[PDB]
Amino acid sequence: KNNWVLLSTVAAVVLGITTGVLVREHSNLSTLEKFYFAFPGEILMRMLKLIILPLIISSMITGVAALDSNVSGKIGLRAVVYYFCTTLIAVILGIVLVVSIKPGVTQKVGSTVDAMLDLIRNMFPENLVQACFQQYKTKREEEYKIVGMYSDGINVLGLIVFCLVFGLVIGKMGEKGQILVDFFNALSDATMKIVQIIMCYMPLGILFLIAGKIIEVEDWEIFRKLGLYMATVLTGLAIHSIVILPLIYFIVVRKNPFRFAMGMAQALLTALMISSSSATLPVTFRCAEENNQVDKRITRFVLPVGATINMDGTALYEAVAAVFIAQLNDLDLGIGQIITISITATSASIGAAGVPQAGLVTMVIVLSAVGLPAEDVTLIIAVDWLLDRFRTMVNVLGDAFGTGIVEKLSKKELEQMDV
Amino acid sequence: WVLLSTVAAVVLGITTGVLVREHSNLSTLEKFYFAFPGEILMRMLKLIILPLIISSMITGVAALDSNVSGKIGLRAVVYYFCTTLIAVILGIVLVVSIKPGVTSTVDAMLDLIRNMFPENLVQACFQQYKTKREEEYKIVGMYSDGINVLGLIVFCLVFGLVIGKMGEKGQILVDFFNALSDATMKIVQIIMCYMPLGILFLIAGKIIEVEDWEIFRKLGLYMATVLTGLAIHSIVILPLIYFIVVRKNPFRFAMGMAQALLTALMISSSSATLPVTFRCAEENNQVDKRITRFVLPVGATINMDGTALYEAVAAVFIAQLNDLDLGIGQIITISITATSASIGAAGVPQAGLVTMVIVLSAVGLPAEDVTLIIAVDWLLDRFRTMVNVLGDAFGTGIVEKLSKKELEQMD
Amino acid sequence: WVLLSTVAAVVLGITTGVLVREHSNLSTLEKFYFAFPGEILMRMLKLIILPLIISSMITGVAALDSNVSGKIGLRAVVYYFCTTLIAVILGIVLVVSIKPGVTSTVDAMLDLIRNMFPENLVQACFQQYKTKREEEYKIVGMYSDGINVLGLIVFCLVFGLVIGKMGEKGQILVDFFNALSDATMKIVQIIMCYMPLGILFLIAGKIIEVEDWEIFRKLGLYMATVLTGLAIHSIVILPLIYFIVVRKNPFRFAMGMAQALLTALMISSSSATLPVTFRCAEENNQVDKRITRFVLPVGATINMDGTALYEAVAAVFIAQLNDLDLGIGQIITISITATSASIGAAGVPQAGLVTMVIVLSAVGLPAEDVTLIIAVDWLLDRFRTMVNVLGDAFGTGIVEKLSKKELEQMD
Ligand SMILES: N[C@@H](CC(=O)O)C(=O)O
Ligand code: NA
Ligand code: NA
Ligand code: NA
């Protein structure tokens, strides 16, 4: 006998690929019948969005309160240094692969500061209850006057920053704040058993979520018309995630880096089907501490921060497609335009959310930084549901690799705390 | 005390409503300021339903995880759920067929399941997902306003189940919500001391706005729907469920309970008639003492068959008073919230009014029309407690035949 | 330190504000990016007022349920509430009559009561009910945005009272909100370390936008309104309240406290001036040691008479700077929020700026205009602490005459 959690998800990917292809050649469902056929995939999607509010709140508090305010200054330093050391490698390796292959040549016909100051406006929200379901967005309009309104979507950057300060303040209070450690440890345990309930609906949900995604109109634009551009994203997403990211693991940890990737197979195949790193963050929590046995004092801090900051897969997809958009024109892309692409794609991957189809909101940032218009993104919208699933597996993998790398880099400081 | 000061609110509220309408002339504005002390009560009730739903669901389910004594504890909880769901379904069918108060359907059933699993817990406290088929058609959601009662009931049932299985690790969460449910049950008692002042100005606001004698024929047909439902459930349904599993003449079982039904009328409390209905089951119908010491204590605060049927009837009567038909996605929302109002009020007779506000807010009905339910509630509250103790009485005979192998082994 | 580093923030914000305006030319866009580090401080302050209101109200009211020593404990709490309410009313009348900053009435009082009892606790954290008379007229509510400070103060007062009466059952709720209030009082101290960097860029954003010399004539009339209110309250009001109940020449009582008032100017802290004003009341004014050991400890964190008057004046001065008149429903919202700011700041002199943001958010005033309050706050902060210990000094003499029968019986 073996495990039924992973073997039924693979059996649902197989039974979901062969279902969403066969119902196209056999029957002809309307646009309304293609929304009720993907309805069990919608219930799984909003069952995972439901659990990330008590999961991010309770893991960020008990992840930092378990560290004695100077160990957490070095876990925090070894996390941001790792996140900058992987985004920069994924941006540079995506830059070299897109200018040596040159996919965009001779197939020509076929508010950056306001978006970066909205990261700091979202780290310190005006209300904590409003931060649980609303984000802040800034538009510039009239010699112009800045005016912002509250859009929708959970402010993950503002609940991480407040609970990081709330986690540090609680741990320095001693016995006067011990009841707040016990409250958010019993809440982080109770909202991980709920994730084990959603994990039993997950094979039934993927089987209709991936059958209702490949049920679209034309398999020709993805295959041949926009071909060899997907062969520059997916090659870089392969080499960064198979070769480069288990080489950073193998240098500092001598413990077989593909044994770690096999133990994260449920979280990798979830983001490969649901295309959202924040929604599969509960799967990444369980599949790291239970399978790979990485210490709970680090995964509660590294994994929520990395889900909204470390987005290596977006950084490579930003660096490939923005050059490819510029390659459909006849721009030179000199030595000054290349480095500013690799710089602003690092900030756009930081400012991008873990929500689905968040790759094209921050694509306007990198495109307008080189001078391209914002309405040149309409060439990419055709194939974006497939390229948004392979760059989320890599995003989850990057976060997972960090937990193992920071733990060996701080095995002494974790062993410092004793009786 | 609280019955005498509510009947006094109705009598002083009817006499005020006819000495103001007949002896003065108010505009549309002064008739709004006259019903202002009742408007404060209607939003003091909606204020408290959010910590009442959350704390009573988590504590009631986590108490049932600790009270179940194997198979005897499980058969009593299963029996309490079916009779409550049958009494609600009997109440829904009777109020839809008779219709007192009068004179797509697939997108409403999928909105039912989308609201059980909301996308956020904080938006579930004040917003509901509603969908709209439009344009060969498209589908758009809107996230309209009003508290999502189904999303909070379903989450806190799953959350309350998880803390019960955690044991020692989650004992601080059981202790937190126990003190949270005791605190908000004391705020409900504070609101029920303001309630006779609020019902007075809110009954009198209705008497000003009437011109007919037809609203009293609708209130008379509402009492004749509840009393019909309480008669079918106590003579036709609950003796039949006894006779399906126990072939032992259920009406002879009911005459043996005759001392317990009369004292459920005088005291009018299902928990305060316990020490008479303990002995009246054992001295007369020869039921085992091991089943009676469990079924009747937990049944006087869980098995609410007359309350659930009454809440189901009263909410559709308000939804027929204001001219609606509820479709089918709102009728199931009545049938879950009225069934879960057994757990959602943690064994308190105070919360009979606020659980009606939970059922009216689960659909989106105007809560200011609950005074017509309250104005005739004192007539029917005596008869609800008689059905609430009859389902407890019939439970001792049903669980005994299902657990006859458990009574030769545990001794 | 914190006084020395805010005066340095105002001087280096004025020196930056006059070397940028006079030596450059910014557009409407660059004037918004220059004041961006002060805009982050203005939303770090609004971030913390929601757990500060909730935790300090629940813990402060439940502490007062445990601190009252029968009749001596009740007379001191009652005295602290009337003088604070008189100093606010004196501050409201003085800022309305003088008006520094210049050059229906029944729907605003009923919106006051509708907002004390909101229809939902989660929407009360970010939304406020507002009504609109329209059409022989009708009345419609809208639920506009902005945090309902009155709904959170009134609920957590009722909630904090209930946990105090629960005792052992609610002891986990007292310990939860005590650790929650100790935690958010430490986050407020973190924000006050960023505050000198934030006031620098937010003062300099104001100096760029000025073209007149009229904002400083209004700031001079604002300091001459607070100092007038502190002079009327300490010479005319508080000696009169002493003379009504104690016929013992209140200026001789004040001269016996002369050593405690002068050391309240040097240290400028009301809790750190306790061991001098203990002996200076007993060695000179012959106060009982049993009354002094209660009134002065609890009065240094509750009786804030000079701060409450100052908060009332500063919020209407901002509401006259931005051209409004507040009607009367917003003036009562000042008079409740500034009075309840004694409990809503758990005895800390750091939190003087963040309680002003609570008063400005209770009405809906722009919180970014609080830098003109801060730029002259260091001049007035010395004189607020002298009045804050004078109400403590006059409190020991007033309660002893009221409780002379409780001092012949406990011995
Ligand atoms: N859902 C995607 C968004 C993107 O980066 O395109 C992610 O979390 O990685
Ligand atoms: Na990275
Ligand atoms: Na990530
Ligand atoms: Na990001």
Short mmCIF file of N, CA and C in Angstrom, two decimals, chain A residues 10-131:
data_model
loop_
_atom_site.label_atom_id
_atom_site.label_comp_id
_atom_site.label_asym_id
_atom_site.label_seq_id
_atom_site.Cartn_x
_atom_site.Cartn_y
_atom_site.Cartn_z
N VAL A 10 -2.50 12.79 -9.16
CA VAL A 10 -1.93 12.39 -10.45
C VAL A 10 -2.99 11.69 -11.28
N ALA A 11 -3.83 10.87 -10.64
CA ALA A 11 -4.92 10.21 -11.34
C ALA A 11 -6.00 11.20 -11.76
N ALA A 12 -6.06 12.37 -11.13
CA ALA A 12 -7.01 13.39 -11.52
C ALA A 12 -6.44 14.34 -12.57
N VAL A 13 -5.12 14.48 -12.62
CA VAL A 13 -4.49 15.22 -13.70
C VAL A 13 -4.62 14.44 -15.00
N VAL A 14 -4.45 13.12 -14.93
CA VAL A 14 -4.59 12.28 -16.12
C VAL A 14 -6.05 12.23 -16.56
N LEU A 15 -6.96 12.01 -15.61
CA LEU A 15 -8.38 11.98 -15.93
C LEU A 15 -8.97 13.37 -16.17
N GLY A 16 -8.20 14.42 -15.96
CA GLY A 16 -8.66 15.77 -16.22
C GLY A 16 -8.11 16.31 -17.52
N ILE A 17 -6.92 15.86 -17.92
CA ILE A 17 -6.42 16.22 -19.24
C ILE A 17 -7.20 15.49 -20.32
N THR A 18 -7.47 14.20 -20.12
CA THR A 18 -8.22 13.43 -21.11
C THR A 18 -9.70 13.75 -21.12
N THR A 19 -10.21 14.48 -20.13
CA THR A 19 -11.60 14.89 -20.16
C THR A 19 -11.77 16.24 -20.85
N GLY A 20 -10.94 17.22 -20.50
CA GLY A 20 -11.02 18.53 -21.13
C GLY A 20 -10.54 18.59 -22.56
N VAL A 21 -9.97 17.51 -23.09
CA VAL A 21 -9.67 17.40 -24.51
C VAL A 21 -10.77 16.65 -25.25
N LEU A 22 -11.32 15.58 -24.64
CA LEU A 22 -12.29 14.74 -25.33
C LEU A 22 -13.64 15.42 -25.47
N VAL A 23 -14.02 16.30 -24.54
CA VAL A 23 -15.32 16.96 -24.65
C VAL A 23 -15.33 18.06 -25.68
N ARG A 24 -14.18 18.40 -26.26
CA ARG A 24 -14.12 19.38 -27.33
C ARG A 24 -14.33 18.73 -28.69
N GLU A 25 -13.68 17.59 -28.94
CA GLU A 25 -13.86 16.89 -30.20
C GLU A 25 -15.18 16.14 -30.27
N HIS A 26 -15.82 15.86 -29.13
CA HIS A 26 -17.05 15.08 -29.13
C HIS A 26 -18.28 15.99 -29.15
N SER A 27 -18.41 16.86 -28.16
CA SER A 27 -19.59 17.70 -28.00
C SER A 27 -19.21 19.16 -28.21
N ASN A 28 -20.22 20.02 -28.19
CA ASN A 28 -20.05 21.47 -28.36
C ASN A 28 -20.89 22.15 -27.29
N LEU A 29 -20.29 22.38 -26.13
CA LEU A 29 -20.98 23.06 -25.05
C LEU A 29 -20.91 24.57 -25.26
N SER A 30 -21.93 25.26 -24.78
CA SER A 30 -21.97 26.70 -24.92
C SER A 30 -21.06 27.37 -23.90
N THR A 31 -21.08 28.70 -23.88
CA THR A 31 -20.24 29.42 -22.93
C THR A 31 -20.78 29.34 -21.51
N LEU A 32 -22.08 29.09 -21.35
CA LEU A 32 -22.65 28.93 -20.02
C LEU A 32 -22.51 27.51 -19.51
N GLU A 33 -22.47 26.52 -20.39
CA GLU A 33 -22.27 25.14 -19.96
C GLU A 33 -20.81 24.85 -19.65
N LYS A 34 -19.89 25.67 -20.16
CA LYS A 34 -18.49 25.54 -19.82
C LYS A 34 -18.15 26.20 -18.50
N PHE A 35 -19.10 26.92 -17.89
CA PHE A 35 -18.92 27.46 -16.56
C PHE A 35 -19.49 26.56 -15.48
N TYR A 36 -20.52 25.78 -15.79
CA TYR A 36 -21.02 24.83 -14.81
C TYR A 36 -20.23 23.53 -14.81
N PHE A 37 -19.51 23.25 -15.90
CA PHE A 37 -18.64 22.08 -15.92
C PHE A 37 -17.38 22.29 -15.11
N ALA A 38 -16.97 23.53 -14.90
CA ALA A 38 -15.83 23.86 -14.06
C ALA A 38 -16.24 24.38 -12.70
N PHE A 39 -17.44 24.03 -12.25
CA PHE A 39 -17.94 24.48 -10.96
C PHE A 39 -17.34 23.73 -9.76
N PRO A 40 -17.08 22.41 -9.78
CA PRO A 40 -16.29 21.83 -8.68
C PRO A 40 -14.86 22.34 -8.62
N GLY A 41 -14.32 22.85 -9.72
CA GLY A 41 -13.03 23.52 -9.65
C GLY A 41 -13.10 24.90 -9.06
N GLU A 42 -14.28 25.53 -9.09
CA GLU A 42 -14.44 26.84 -8.48
C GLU A 42 -14.61 26.74 -6.98
N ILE A 43 -15.26 25.67 -6.50
CA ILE A 43 -15.46 25.49 -5.07
C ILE A 43 -14.15 25.18 -4.37
N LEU A 44 -13.27 24.42 -5.02
CA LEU A 44 -11.93 24.18 -4.47
C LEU A 44 -11.10 25.45 -4.44
N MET A 45 -11.30 26.33 -5.42
CA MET A 45 -10.51 27.56 -5.48
C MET A 45 -10.89 28.51 -4.36
N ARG A 46 -12.18 28.62 -4.05
CA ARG A 46 -12.62 29.49 -2.97
C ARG A 46 -12.61 28.79 -1.62
N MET A 47 -12.31 27.50 -1.58
CA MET A 47 -12.03 26.84 -0.32
C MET A 47 -10.58 27.01 0.10
N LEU A 48 -9.69 27.26 -0.85
CA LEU A 48 -8.29 27.54 -0.55
C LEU A 48 -8.05 29.01 -0.27
N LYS A 49 -8.82 29.91 -0.89
CA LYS A 49 -8.73 31.32 -0.54
C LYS A 49 -9.28 31.59 0.86
N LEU A 50 -10.22 30.77 1.30
CA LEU A 50 -10.82 30.91 2.62
C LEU A 50 -9.81 30.65 3.73
N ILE A 51 -8.90 29.69 3.53
CA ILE A 51 -8.04 29.24 4.61
C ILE A 51 -6.76 30.06 4.72
N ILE A 52 -6.43 30.90 3.73
CA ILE A 52 -5.19 31.66 3.81
C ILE A 52 -5.26 32.87 4.73
N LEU A 53 -6.44 33.26 5.19
CA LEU A 53 -6.47 34.34 6.16
C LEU A 53 -6.11 33.88 7.57
N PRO A 54 -6.64 32.77 8.13
CA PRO A 54 -6.11 32.33 9.42
C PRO A 54 -4.78 31.61 9.33
N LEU A 55 -4.34 31.22 8.15
CA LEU A 55 -3.05 30.54 8.03
C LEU A 55 -1.90 31.53 8.03
N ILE A 56 -2.04 32.63 7.30
CA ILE A 56 -0.98 33.62 7.23
C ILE A 56 -0.87 34.38 8.55
N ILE A 57 -2.01 34.63 9.19
CA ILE A 57 -2.03 35.36 10.45
C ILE A 57 -1.40 34.53 11.57
N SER A 58 -1.73 33.24 11.65
CA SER A 58 -1.25 32.43 12.75
C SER A 58 0.15 31.88 12.55
N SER A 59 0.62 31.75 11.31
CA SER A 59 1.98 31.27 11.11
C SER A 59 3.00 32.39 11.23
N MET A 60 2.63 33.61 10.84
CA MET A 60 3.55 34.73 10.97
C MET A 60 3.72 35.16 12.42
N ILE A 61 2.72 34.92 13.26
CA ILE A 61 2.84 35.31 14.66
C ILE A 61 3.66 34.29 15.43
N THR A 62 3.30 33.01 15.34
CA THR A 62 4.04 31.99 16.07
C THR A 62 5.36 31.60 15.41
N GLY A 63 5.61 32.04 14.18
CA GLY A 63 6.90 31.78 13.58
C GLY A 63 8.00 32.69 14.08
N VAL A 64 7.64 33.89 14.54
CA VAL A 64 8.61 34.88 14.98
C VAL A 64 8.64 34.94 16.50
N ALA A 65 7.51 34.62 17.14
CA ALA A 65 7.46 34.64 18.60
C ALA A 65 8.24 33.49 19.22
N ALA A 66 8.52 32.44 18.45
CA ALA A 66 9.35 31.33 18.91
C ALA A 66 10.83 31.63 18.84
N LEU A 67 11.22 32.76 18.26
CA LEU A 67 12.61 33.17 18.17
C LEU A 67 12.83 34.38 19.08
N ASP A 68 13.99 34.42 19.73
CA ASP A 68 14.24 35.39 20.80
C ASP A 68 14.87 36.69 20.31
N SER A 69 14.32 37.26 19.23
CA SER A 69 14.48 38.63 18.75
C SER A 69 15.88 38.98 18.25
N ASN A 70 16.85 38.07 18.34
CA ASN A 70 18.13 38.20 17.67
C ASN A 70 18.45 37.02 16.78
N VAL A 71 17.89 35.85 17.08
CA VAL A 71 17.86 34.76 16.12
C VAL A 71 16.99 35.12 14.93
N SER A 72 15.87 35.81 15.17
CA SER A 72 14.98 36.22 14.09
C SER A 72 15.57 37.33 13.24
N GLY A 73 16.56 38.06 13.74
CA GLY A 73 17.25 39.02 12.90
C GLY A 73 18.21 38.40 11.92
N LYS A 74 18.59 37.14 12.15
CA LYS A 74 19.47 36.43 11.24
C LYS A 74 18.73 35.40 10.39
N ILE A 75 17.59 34.90 10.85
CA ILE A 75 16.71 34.16 9.96
C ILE A 75 16.11 35.11 8.93
N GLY A 76 15.77 36.32 9.36
CA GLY A 76 15.27 37.33 8.44
C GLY A 76 16.32 37.83 7.48
N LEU A 77 17.58 37.87 7.90
CA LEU A 77 18.65 38.31 7.00
C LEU A 77 19.02 37.22 6.01
N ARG A 78 19.00 35.96 6.44
CA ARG A 78 19.29 34.85 5.54
C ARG A 78 18.11 34.51 4.64
N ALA A 79 16.95 35.10 4.87
CA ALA A 79 15.82 34.91 3.98
C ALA A 79 15.82 35.94 2.86
N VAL A 80 16.08 37.21 3.19
CA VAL A 80 16.08 38.24 2.16
C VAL A 80 17.31 38.12 1.27
N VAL A 81 18.45 37.67 1.82
CA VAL A 81 19.63 37.47 0.99
C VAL A 81 19.42 36.30 0.03
N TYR A 82 18.73 35.24 0.48
CA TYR A 82 18.42 34.12 -0.41
C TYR A 82 17.42 34.53 -1.49
N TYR A 83 16.45 35.37 -1.13
CA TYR A 83 15.44 35.76 -2.11
C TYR A 83 16.02 36.68 -3.17
N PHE A 84 16.99 37.51 -2.80
CA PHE A 84 17.65 38.34 -3.79
C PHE A 84 18.65 37.55 -4.63
N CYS A 85 19.15 36.45 -4.07
CA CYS A 85 20.17 35.60 -4.74
C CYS A 85 19.53 34.62 -5.72
N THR A 86 18.19 34.50 -5.72
CA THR A 86 17.51 33.62 -6.66
C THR A 86 16.71 34.37 -7.70
N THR A 87 16.13 35.52 -7.33
CA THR A 87 15.46 36.37 -8.31
C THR A 87 16.46 36.90 -9.32
N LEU A 88 17.64 37.32 -8.85
CA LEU A 88 18.67 37.83 -9.75
C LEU A 88 19.22 36.74 -10.66
N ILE A 89 19.28 35.49 -10.19
CA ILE A 89 19.75 34.43 -11.07
C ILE A 89 18.68 34.08 -12.10
N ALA A 90 17.42 34.04 -11.67
CA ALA A 90 16.32 33.76 -12.60
C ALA A 90 16.06 34.90 -13.58
N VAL A 91 16.38 36.14 -13.21
CA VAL A 91 16.23 37.22 -14.18
C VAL A 91 17.35 37.18 -15.21
N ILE A 92 18.60 36.96 -14.77
CA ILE A 92 19.75 36.98 -15.67
C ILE A 92 19.71 35.79 -16.62
N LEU A 93 19.36 34.61 -16.10
CA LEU A 93 19.27 33.41 -16.93
C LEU A 93 18.10 33.50 -17.90
N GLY A 94 17.05 34.24 -17.55
CA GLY A 94 16.00 34.51 -18.52
C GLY A 94 16.37 35.57 -19.53
N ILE A 95 17.32 36.44 -19.19
CA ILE A 95 17.77 37.45 -20.14
C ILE A 95 18.69 36.84 -21.19
N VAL A 96 19.60 35.96 -20.76
CA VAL A 96 20.54 35.33 -21.69
C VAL A 96 19.82 34.37 -22.64
N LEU A 97 18.83 33.63 -22.15
CA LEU A 97 18.14 32.66 -23.00
C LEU A 97 17.22 33.33 -24.01
N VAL A 98 16.80 34.57 -23.78
CA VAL A 98 15.88 35.22 -24.70
C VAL A 98 16.60 36.03 -25.77
N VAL A 99 17.87 36.39 -25.55
CA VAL A 99 18.62 37.15 -26.55
C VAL A 99 19.58 36.27 -27.33
N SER A 100 19.74 35.00 -26.95
CA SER A 100 20.51 34.04 -27.73
C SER A 100 19.62 33.18 -28.62
N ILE A 101 18.44 32.82 -28.13
CA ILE A 101 17.47 32.11 -28.97
C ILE A 101 16.87 33.07 -29.99
N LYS A 102 16.56 34.30 -29.56
CA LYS A 102 15.88 35.37 -30.29
C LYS A 102 14.56 34.88 -30.87
N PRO A 103 13.52 34.72 -30.04
CA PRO A 103 12.25 34.21 -30.57
C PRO A 103 11.44 35.24 -31.33
N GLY A 104 11.64 36.53 -31.09
CA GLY A 104 10.80 37.59 -31.61
C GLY A 104 11.16 38.17 -32.96
N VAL A 105 12.29 37.80 -33.53
CA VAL A 105 12.76 38.37 -34.79
C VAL A 105 11.99 37.78 -35.96
N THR A 106 11.60 38.67 -36.88
CA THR A 106 10.96 38.42 -38.20
C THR A 106 9.61 37.69 -38.10
N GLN A 107 8.97 37.85 -36.95
CA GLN A 107 7.58 37.40 -36.72
C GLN A 107 6.90 38.67 -36.21
N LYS A 108 7.16 39.80 -36.89
CA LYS A 108 6.73 41.08 -36.31
C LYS A 108 5.22 41.34 -36.36
N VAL A 109 4.49 41.14 -37.48
CA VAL A 109 3.03 41.36 -37.40
C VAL A 109 2.27 40.25 -36.70
N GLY A 110 2.74 39.00 -36.79
CA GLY A 110 2.05 37.89 -36.16
C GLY A 110 1.00 37.25 -37.04
N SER A 111 3.41 55.01 -15.00
CA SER A 111 3.09 54.97 -13.58
C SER A 111 3.87 53.86 -12.89
N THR A 112 5.18 53.82 -13.13
CA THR A 112 6.03 52.84 -12.48
C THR A 112 6.27 53.22 -11.02
N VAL A 113 6.45 54.51 -10.75
CA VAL A 113 6.67 54.98 -9.39
C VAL A 113 5.39 54.90 -8.57
N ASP A 114 4.22 55.05 -9.20
CA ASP A 114 2.97 54.91 -8.47
C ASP A 114 2.65 53.47 -8.13
N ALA A 115 3.21 52.51 -8.86
CA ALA A 115 3.03 51.11 -8.51
C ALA A 115 4.05 50.63 -7.49
N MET A 116 5.21 51.27 -7.41
CA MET A 116 6.21 50.88 -6.43
C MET A 116 6.01 51.59 -5.10
N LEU A 117 5.38 52.76 -5.10
CA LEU A 117 4.99 53.39 -3.85
C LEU A 117 3.71 52.80 -3.29
N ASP A 118 3.00 52.00 -4.08
CA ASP A 118 1.85 51.27 -3.57
C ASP A 118 2.25 50.01 -2.83
N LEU A 119 3.51 49.60 -2.92
CA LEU A 119 3.99 48.51 -2.08
C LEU A 119 4.17 48.98 -0.65
N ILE A 120 4.63 50.21 -0.48
CA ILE A 120 4.82 50.75 0.86
C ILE A 120 3.48 51.21 1.43
N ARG A 121 2.55 51.62 0.57
CA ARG A 121 1.22 51.96 1.05
C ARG A 121 0.42 50.73 1.43
N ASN A 122 0.79 49.56 0.90
CA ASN A 122 0.12 48.32 1.25
C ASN A 122 0.81 47.57 2.38
N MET A 123 2.04 47.93 2.73
CA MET A 123 2.68 47.29 3.87
C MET A 123 2.14 47.84 5.18
N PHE A 124 1.66 49.08 5.18
CA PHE A 124 1.09 49.73 6.35
C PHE A 124 -0.31 50.18 5.98
N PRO A 125 -1.30 49.29 6.07
CA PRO A 125 -2.66 49.64 5.68
C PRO A 125 -3.32 50.51 6.73
N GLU A 126 -4.34 51.26 6.30
CA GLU A 126 -5.02 52.16 7.21
C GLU A 126 -5.94 51.43 8.18
N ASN A 127 -6.31 50.19 7.90
CA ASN A 127 -7.20 49.44 8.78
C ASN A 127 -6.85 47.97 8.69
N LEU A 128 -6.89 47.28 9.84
CA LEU A 128 -6.54 45.86 9.84
C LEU A 128 -7.68 44.98 9.34
N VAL A 129 -8.93 45.33 9.64
CA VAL A 129 -10.05 44.54 9.14
C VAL A 129 -10.23 44.76 7.65
N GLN A 130 -9.99 45.99 7.19
CA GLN A 130 -10.07 46.26 5.77
C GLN A 130 -8.91 45.66 5.01
N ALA A 131 -7.78 45.41 5.68
CA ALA A 131 -6.65 44.77 5.02
C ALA A 131 -6.89 43.29 4.78
#
